[PDB]
Design a protein around this ligand. Sequence first.
Ligand SMILES: [Mg+2]
Ligand SMILES: [Mg+2]
Ligand SMILES: [Mg+2]
Ligand SMILES: [Mg+2]
Ligand SMILES: [Mg+2]
Ligand SMILES: [Mg+2]
Ligand SMILES: [Mg+2]
Ligand SMILES: [Mg+2]
Ligand SMILES: [Mg+2]
Ligand SMILES: [Mg+2]
Ligand SMILES: [Mg+2]
Ligand SMILES: [Mg+2]
Ligand SMILES: [Mg+2]
Ligand SMILES: [Mg+2]
Ligand SMILES: [Mg+2]
Ligand SMILES: [Mg+2]
Ligand SMILES: [Mg+2]
Ligand SMILES: [Mg+2]
Ligand SMILES: [Mg+2]
Ligand SMILES: [Mg+2]
Ligand SMILES: [Mg+2]
Ligand SMILES: [Mg+2]
Ligand SMILES: [Mg+2]
Ligand SMILES: [Mg+2]
Ligand SMILES: [Mg+2]
Ligand SMILES: [Mg+2]
Ligand SMILES: [Mg+2]
Ligand SMILES: [Mg+2]
Ligand SMILES: [Mg+2]
Ligand SMILES: [Mg+2]
Ligand SMILES: [Mg+2]
Ligand SMILES: [Mg+2]
Ligand SMILES: [Mg+2]
Ligand SMILES: [Mg+2]
Ligand SMILES: [Mg+2]
Ligand SMILES: [Mg+2]
Ligand SMILES: [Mg+2]
Ligand SMILES: [Mg+2]
Ligand SMILES: [Mg+2]
Ligand SMILES: [Mg+2]
Ligand SMILES: [Mg+2]
Ligand SMILES: [Mg+2]
Ligand SMILES: [Mg+2]
Ligand SMILES: [Mg+2]
Ligand SMILES: [Mg+2]
Ligand SMILES: [Mg+2]
Ligand SMILES: [Mg+2]
Ligand SMILES: [Mg+2]
Ligand SMILES: [Mg+2]
Ligand SMILES: [Mg+2]
Ligand SMILES: [Mg+2]
Ligand SMILES: [Mg+2]
Ligand SMILES: [Mg+2]
Ligand SMILES: [Mg+2]
Ligand SMILES: [Mg+2]
Ligand SMILES: [Mg+2]
Ligand SMILES: [Mg+2]
Ligand SMILES: [Mg+2]
Ligand SMILES: [Mg+2]
Ligand SMILES: [Mg+2]
Ligand SMILES: [Mg+2]
Length: 245
Amino acid sequence: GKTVLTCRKGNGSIYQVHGHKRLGPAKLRILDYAERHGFMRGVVKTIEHEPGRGAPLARVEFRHPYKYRRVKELMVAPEGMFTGQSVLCGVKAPLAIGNVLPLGQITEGCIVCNVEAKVGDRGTIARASGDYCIIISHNHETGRTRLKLPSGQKKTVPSNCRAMIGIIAGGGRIEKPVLKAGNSFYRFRGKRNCWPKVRGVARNPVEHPHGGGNHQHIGHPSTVSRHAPPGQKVGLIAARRTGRI
RNA sequence: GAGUCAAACAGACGCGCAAGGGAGAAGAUAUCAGUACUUCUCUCGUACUGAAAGGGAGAUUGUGGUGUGCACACUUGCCCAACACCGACCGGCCCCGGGUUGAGUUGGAGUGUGCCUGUUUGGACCCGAAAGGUGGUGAACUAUGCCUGAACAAGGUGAAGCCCGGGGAAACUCGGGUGGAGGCCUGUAGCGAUGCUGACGUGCAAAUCGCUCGCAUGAUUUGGGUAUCGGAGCGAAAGACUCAUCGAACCACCUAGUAGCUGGUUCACAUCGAAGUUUCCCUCAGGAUAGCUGGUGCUUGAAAAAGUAUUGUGCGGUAAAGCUUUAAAUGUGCAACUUGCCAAAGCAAGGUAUUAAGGCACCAAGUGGGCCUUCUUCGGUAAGCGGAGCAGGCGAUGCGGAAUGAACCGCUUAGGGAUAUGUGGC
RNA sequence: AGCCCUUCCGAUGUAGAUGUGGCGUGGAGGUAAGGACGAAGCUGAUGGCGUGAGCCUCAGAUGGACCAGCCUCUAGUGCAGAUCUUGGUUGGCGUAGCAAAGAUCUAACGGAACGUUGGAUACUGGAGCGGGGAAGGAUUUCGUGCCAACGGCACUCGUACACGAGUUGUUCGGAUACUGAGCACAACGUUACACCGUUUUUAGGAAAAGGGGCAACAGAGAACCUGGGAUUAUAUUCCAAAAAGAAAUUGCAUG
RNA sequence: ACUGCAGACCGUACUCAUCACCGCAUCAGGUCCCCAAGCAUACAAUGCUCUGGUACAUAGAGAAAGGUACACUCAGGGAAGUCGGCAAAAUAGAUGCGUAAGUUCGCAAGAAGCAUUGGCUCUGAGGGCAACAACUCAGAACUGCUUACGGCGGGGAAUCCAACUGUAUAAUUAAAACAUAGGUUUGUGAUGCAUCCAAGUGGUGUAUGUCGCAAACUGAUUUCUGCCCAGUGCUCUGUGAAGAGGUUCACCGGCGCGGGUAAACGGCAAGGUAGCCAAAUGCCUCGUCUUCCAAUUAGAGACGCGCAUGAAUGGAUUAAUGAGAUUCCCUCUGUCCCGAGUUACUAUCUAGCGAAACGACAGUCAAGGGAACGGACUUGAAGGGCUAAGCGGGGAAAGAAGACCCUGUUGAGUUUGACUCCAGUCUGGCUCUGUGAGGCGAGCUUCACUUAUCGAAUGAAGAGACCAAUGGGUUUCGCGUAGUCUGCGGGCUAUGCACCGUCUCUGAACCAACGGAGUCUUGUUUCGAGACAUCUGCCAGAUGGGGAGUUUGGCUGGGGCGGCAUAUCUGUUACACGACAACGCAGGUGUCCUAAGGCGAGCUCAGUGGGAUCUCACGUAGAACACAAGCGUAAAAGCUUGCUUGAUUAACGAUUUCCAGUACGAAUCGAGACUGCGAAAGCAAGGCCAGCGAUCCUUUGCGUAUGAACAAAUCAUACCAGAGGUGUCAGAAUAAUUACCACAGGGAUAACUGGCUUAUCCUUCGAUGUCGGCUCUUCCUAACCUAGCGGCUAAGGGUUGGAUUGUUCACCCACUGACAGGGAACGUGAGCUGGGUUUAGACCGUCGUGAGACAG
RNA sequence: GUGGAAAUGCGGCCAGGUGACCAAUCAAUCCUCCCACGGUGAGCUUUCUUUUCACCAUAAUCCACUUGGGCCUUUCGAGUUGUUCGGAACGGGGGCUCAAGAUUGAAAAAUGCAGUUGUGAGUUCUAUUAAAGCAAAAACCUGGGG
Ligand SMILES: [Mg+2]
Ligand SMILES: [Mg+2]
Ligand SMILES: [Mg+2]
Ligand SMILES: [Mg+2]
Ligand SMILES: [Mg+2]
Ligand SMILES: [Mg+2]
Ligand SMILES: [Mg+2]
Ligand SMILES: [Mg+2]
Ligand SMILES: [Mg+2]
Ligand SMILES: [Mg+2]
Ligand SMILES: [Mg+2]
Ligand SMILES: [Mg+2]
Ligand SMILES: [Mg+2]
Ligand SMILES: [Mg+2]
Ligand SMILES: [Mg+2]
Ligand SMILES: [Mg+2]
Ligand SMILES: [Mg+2]
Ligand SMILES: [Mg+2]
Ligand SMILES: [Mg+2]
Ligand SMILES: [Mg+2]
Ligand SMILES: [Mg+2]
Ligand SMILES: [Mg+2]
Ligand SMILES: [Mg+2]
Ligand SMILES: [Mg+2]
Ligand SMILES: [Mg+2]
Ligand SMILES: [Mg+2]
Ligand SMILES: [Mg+2]
Ligand SMILES: [Mg+2]
Ligand SMILES: [Mg+2]
Ligand SMILES: [Mg+2]
Ligand SMILES: [Mg+2]
Ligand SMILES: [Mg+2]
Ligand SMILES: [Mg+2]
Ligand SMILES: [Mg+2]
Ligand SMILES: [Mg+2]
Ligand SMILES: [Mg+2]
Ligand SMILES: [Mg+2]
Ligand SMILES: [Mg+2]
Ligand SMILES: [Mg+2]
Ligand SMILES: [Mg+2]
Ligand SMILES: [Mg+2]
Ligand SMILES: [Mg+2]
Ligand SMILES: [Mg+2]
Ligand SMILES: [Mg+2]
Ligand SMILES: [Mg+2]
Ligand SMILES: [Mg+2]
Ligand SMILES: [Mg+2]
Ligand SMILES: [Mg+2]
Ligand SMILES: [Mg+2]
Ligand SMILES: [Mg+2]
Ligand SMILES: [Mg+2]
Ligand SMILES: [Mg+2]
Ligand SMILES: [Mg+2]
Ligand SMILES: [Mg+2]
Ligand SMILES: [Mg+2]
Ligand SMILES: [Mg+2]
Ligand SMILES: [Mg+2]
Ligand SMILES: [Mg+2]
Ligand SMILES: [Mg+2]
Ligand SMILES: [Mg+2]
Ligand SMILES: [Mg+2]
């Protein structure tokens, strides 16, 4: 045959993220001693658009814990995070929007964003716009809170894990129809060479497992096995069910 | 410019020695990669057989016998070679003296070499694929992404916001302007490229020209830079594009790849001269096999002569006949003392017409599409049709004749002359 | 070229086989011989010989120095045909054409005979057959001469030929001296192997917190302007003391 | 401030283009940037002009046919032309009016449609700055028109498709395809998902984090997406024993079932729902009806026995959009009737210059024959030679070893539930792998531990302790208690002392004023997991077109399709020895039988007839003899019956058939043994004749041999004799597809082309352009009209224009005296046209698992 | 260091700024173009033509010093062609300051040219889509602190 496009994206050549104009990683502050035994006040300096990203990123400027210099630092913004706002990261941070305080100290039922799964990893869950995760339980005896991932998905993480308070900003992007082929041209301009998506049945038999034939049709089930070798694992992958739900 | 070189076999022919032949590597010497010389070995052979352990051939001072058998001898002998038949014997295998088996033996024929031919393999007579592999080179064309720049006349329509007004209980509508929106419109530039299926079409051009046309504020066009490629890259996806190369680039190499296929294969003359059929083959465009043919002989000379009769003796079941049976013609075959059986020594067996050189061996080629016709048929509605039988032809062959004709007719053929003819004519 | 004679029979022939004191070629061992009184080669109404391949002789008003015979050895040995290879030549044929973008005319001169100037006439028509640059080219530039060849006609002319010239910078651009998409040295790791990968390195990277470098002649950066009577050809580069001049700017130093 | 000195490197010419670059060139092609006048004008359109540049594109003379054109004009008609309004014409600027359906309310729209427009002399309007400037609009008279630059939309009504803009086969396809938004679905919480890499503390999505990413399908909106989970897919649920040992046997170690899923593949297990249609999907078929016309294979609209519609393999419907398909209309026209005239450049003739293709040889015909359509031959008929311009009939003209087709034990691309595999994935075991506490069972798991390992974070930036032990022992090294031990020095277990050990709704901040700022360390940077694995390595199993290599028999009146005539038997073909062919003809064959074999004996049968299964007669085989057929057979070879195993062994006996005089099979004559039957001779080593098979290997038997230093046992091997099988039957182990295709050939072999016949395969595959039309000529006559007769003669001349459809053909409308049939390579493509056929693109239906196929 | 009530005027590290990022439009200059005037040269000139054409130039550098914006201060309107704005300070008076610009002059008439200004137009430069938000960095600057 010939290499499938799903496999070629793994070369990550043409298919790499753009990101020249990206501001850098949008993370939480390094889990300092100050985070673990107090709090760091950083004022939000400016809320930026990172191209290719939905959520605005904030520019909180924490003062450096150990030296005379000030440490501007960039994290995806919770909604209502205005410039000049004083963020408070740390274990005994007050419970407010934008504050980053230990997950086990956040009240059960309150919704948090930019949650970190592993302790100290600097915020990986609930980072996309509009996204958040409600804390659904604490377990102080074993120090592991549960939380509901932005997908209907429960997950247990240590309470020492940081989280930010509130919904991530920029929510509701997806609600607006794109309408133009050109409009989606630009949302992916800042993302990657993801787009346009040619259908595999429109492709040739060399190009794709679905490709080829006179009427353009898949010839075999589109629901591929989990163990299917790459270049084969196209169509619906390890699908448990198909059909509209 | 195209059967070569090597090598391994084989037959034939030449040479050497011969129950042996020969060296090779190497050496030693004398004088020049030669010639001369030789040890020691090795090698093929003289012994074969069996899977193997193993065993291993003379007869009753000499052909094992017998049959047919040159020459010579003598008036039949001996028979050479040779064939055949039979022993015995060696090995192996058995049976209960017998069978049988070997590429055995039976007074060695091998060997080295030259040379030709044949087989094989190698580039393999020469030339030719589509490919396969190995490794490199390419994103200047072009595909895509990114960086960073550049570009886009003149109109048109006229969105949101805004502003003024009229109406309304309110409700928020109706004028009018404003404004300049849009993968908006017309249309430059630019980017394309629909149509004329226009020009051109050995062109200006290995894709161009003309007019027409499409997009032309956008998913636009464009420079530079940069990233991604060959079982790979890139693709709004046409298997498109990846330097005029893409259903797998280009370069080099393996590689003179392979070809049962196509094409070619170079002096003369003389001597003979086919086959297109048999069996077998993943065989059907090819082989192997046998036949046909050549060469070499060998062997001896009405030997085992015969595409023919006659005579004698078989065979037959087609035509005709007949109502599935009698039976042609053309054919077809053939001929010219010792030791079993018996009751026993008698039987059995082995022994004291025309014409014409016969047989045998070896090696080898081409061929293995046939065609026509005669007669006979089979299939087909029929055919310049498919299939067979017979014989003859053409193929491979003219010549004479049928005006003409591959195969009809006559006749078949060295270079010529006379004569006379053949078919055909006058 | 059969030792001679006599008689008899045969004679075609594709594929193929075979024969041949058969032909012929390059070379070798021999022999014999030839050649500047002309070898080979080549030419040939030069005949002669041979069935033939061919040989021989003659003649060159050809050549200029090698070489035939014979026996033996050898082979890269004989060609009308391979859409054969290579070179040359040919018919077609002085033909097909040299018809896209409107265009020249005149006189004078030049010249051995198209140019030059004047005039006339048009054209381009500022998205130009204009004036500068990138890429690319790299002497094409300029002058003199030349026009053999080339400029598909012609040339007296040329981007052609030959000869001689020509490109001037504190400030232009570039580098010195930015970063960018990116790249990759180092180290480290992987690999049978570094010609791989990350791009910082399980890592002690300071020599007086995160190694070194590169990557934009359109991005960032960037101190200079005009006048010239200054060239055949360069000028924001040349100019000379009244620098035509006027500046800005960097370094050091100086009062 | 000044002044003084110094200010280095390289670039620098020219070009930047119908002659300087790329394109083999001074090539009409291509190639980034900058500056860019005047007038008309809305203008960078277009025309023209100053400046700057050109006058270089070979020229001349003249003005045959035919051409090219970025040239026109054409009476009357007006699409009749054609496949098709192709091409041309036509519309056109501005202003004022006016503007339909339909619609997503934006549009449609420049809809459509009328109307006015010049010149001139005037008027009006519209501003600025203080105490002169535009130039548009408007109006008015008067007057003019030859309707007189350039430039500038033709319009409308419908159907199909796609929603739209877009993209896209560079060099035949710009589409209806791709994209698209929108829709759905799948995976997935980072230990991830997809995925690159040979490999790694490697890489991509991911600079990310479910409003994300990765994978698919559908394809805007509106509307709807029915039924089917049966298939398929996806998903989910080492240890013992024997043995001397090799070894062998045994025990434990992801599937099956079951469930779910169709916006999975698909069907309509379910039986096609809503819809929609002779639709790009309907064979029949030009369906039928209606509408459109004079006429309609067209169209539109209905209808629905739908060959073979139908629902995200999306259904339907859709305004806007469209160089999309299609029908009609108005306008318009040289498309046409039916051509004519003009132009300019060609051609023509000249000066200069100067190829190519092609080239066997040539080159008048008719007939003939012939490789079956001759330029060479036979026989006739022509023909003096050489020319110039045309021309396109022939030269089966040239072009290219036919892209078609077939063949080849040739390719490649694709597919796959072909064969063989290989990565990937997952699973398992082991390993990595330590330590404590358990329990269970005869080293397994729970549970903690932590130093391996793993993950994470970090610029390794603050861990634990001091709060004190089922803790430590080198300045703490030591004591005391009980138990035991002793190398007499102490040890060890328990244990307690000590000691290790101890302190408290954006401002600014640093560069310290022994400490200030705690000390300590059986160390780990921290955090998490943790002997698990997000770990290593190795084996294992499954999966695995993701990829790879390979194959995908033959024959065959081409191939495929089947058949199999691919091995064998009978009758026939077959022609009175033997042999003899055809996808020739009629049948058979792979078996079957302990008996249906062997033997003996007895017997007689099929059927007919006479009587009542029987009885008698006759009874030439008319029956039976496994099996098709032939043969043969009567006290039998049949039938019953009895006894039986000769259907054994058979020393390698020889032979026949096939034949090559090889084999296999089959069979015949034998010999030896031992039998069987029979009084006996005799008969029997199967059932006559078809019923079956190498090498290698496996296996079984049998009677010694080898395992080569020796020996025995095991094992293995060997000899020898059977068996397992190659049915393609003298024996590879083998799926499709290609219209994207390719090569070597083939006229050995199709379509095609002539011939023959009424299909053959003769020519042609190093190529002879297809149907049709148009155009033009010509010939025939089984005469349609005309003419003469009375159906016959008669080939003379003529035989129409249209609608539908590519057509031919047919059918229609109209005319006509009539609208005849044919030949000429189904006349005529270096004459055209290119509608049909029509390669690649694409769509639909059906077929196919798929790639792909369909003479739809 | 220093003036000013103020806006502000003059004389290591750390943080910020410049670099630095938009189509258009509007405005100013620039430039080109036109016109008017005036000069100068040339040309037409049968006739006509107070005429037609050309030219009338002003470099960087420096020195003194109207439009747009920001700000200081003082005591419903404001605003644009345009989608604004105002007690978080609108308007008015005075002031500050930036950005362009004008004029005064130095350059510089010793140049250019050849035998003048002004006026009009154009050009020039200095929001929208956005699920698009439209580079970096050295250099350099200024500060805070020392
Ligand atoms: Mg496709
Ligand atoms: Mg595939
Ligand atoms: Mg589809
Ligand atoms: Mg489909
Ligand atoms: Mg021997
Ligand atoms: Mg060869
Ligand atoms: Mg050979
Ligand atoms: Mg080759
Ligand atoms: Mg291969
Ligand atoms: Mg547009
Ligand atoms: Mg248009
Ligand atoms: Mg395709
Ligand atoms: Mg003969
Ligand atoms: Mg052949
Ligand atoms: Mg008979
Ligand atoms: Mg008869
Ligand atoms: Mg004759
Ligand atoms: Mg002869
Ligand atoms: Mg030689
Ligand atoms: Mg002559
Ligand atoms: Mg040779
Ligand atoms: Mg000519
Ligand atoms: Mg002009
Ligand atoms: Mg020059
Ligand atoms: Mg030169
Ligand atoms: Mg970088
Ligand atoms: Mg650099
Ligand atoms: Mg620059
Ligand atoms: Mg510079
Ligand atoms: Mg110059
Ligand atoms: Mg220059
Ligand atoms: Mg230029
Ligand atoms: Mg213009
Ligand atoms: Mg123009
Ligand atoms: Mg007319
Ligand atoms: Mg018409
Ligand atoms: Mg018509
Ligand atoms: Mg017609
Ligand atoms: Mg047209
Ligand atoms: Mg309406
Ligand atoms: Mg479309
Ligand atoms: Mg194309
Ligand atoms: Mg589509
Ligand atoms: Mg939809
Ligand atoms: Mg459905
Ligand atoms: Mg209809
Ligand atoms: Mg369907
Ligand atoms: Mg379009
Ligand atoms: Mg061929
Ligand atoms: Mg074959
Ligand atoms: Mg092969
Ligand atoms: Mg017979
Ligand atoms: Mg009997
Ligand atoms: Mg035998
Ligand atoms: Mg046998
Ligand atoms: Mg039998
Ligand atoms: Mg066979
Ligand atoms: Mg044939
Ligand atoms: Mg025809
Ligand atoms: Mg023709
Ligand atoms: Mg100045």
